[model samples]
Target: MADKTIFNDHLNTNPKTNLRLWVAFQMMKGAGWAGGVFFGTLLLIGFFRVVGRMLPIQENQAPAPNITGALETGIELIKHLV
Candidate 1:
């Protein structure tokens, strides 16, 4: 004959409050970390873009010097020689 039951005399009332506070703090921390990363990345990106735009290579900017036509003539030269 075993008569052992759970006692519910003193119930905890601060469980929900503590959990909500903890969740809010976690969310705040996540937002801060993500905002910091975005700020840093965008700052560097903006600086690099401005620098690149300010300083451009003006001379010897060939669009297709030996990219398209050179391939055809180079093979033609090899065929003609052989």
Candidate 2:
């Protein structure tokens, strides 16, 4: 009967539905990664900016050591130790 056919069709799985779900999942994952990178970069930039501000550059004087660069180098050295 037409009713049974319609019910059976509704019960059947569609590949397009699966594909759409997969695409949606991937889009969500990509968005999360993009957001994480954006926020992390912003934080790092803010941190470096603060450090730069705290250690003002000298005019007509010898170059001063960079605090941010020193911190990064120290972290790398420690990382290598482990």
Best by lDDT: 2
lDDT of 2 by residue, 1-82 (tens): 1233244575545545666666766678645985577667877898778767645443223343443323333455455665
After superposition, candidate 1 runs with Cα above 4 Å error: 1-31, 55-82
| lDDT for 62 (candidate 2) | 39
- Considering only N, C-alpha and C atoms within 3 Å, which residue pairs clash in candidate 2? none
Candidate 2 Cα errors over 4 Å, as ranges: 1-31, 55-82
The TM-score of predicted model 2 comes to: 0.27
On TM-score, the candidate that comes out on top is 1
TM-score of each: 0.28, 0.27
Quality of model 1 by C-alpha lDDT: 0.53
Clashes of each: 0, 0
Cα lDDT computed for each candidate against the true fold: 0.53, 0.55
RMSD of each: 14.4, 10.5
* Model 2 C-alpha RMSD to native: 10.5
Which 10 residues in a row give candidate 1 its minimum summed lDDT? 1-10
- Model 1: how far residue 72 lies from native, Å: 39
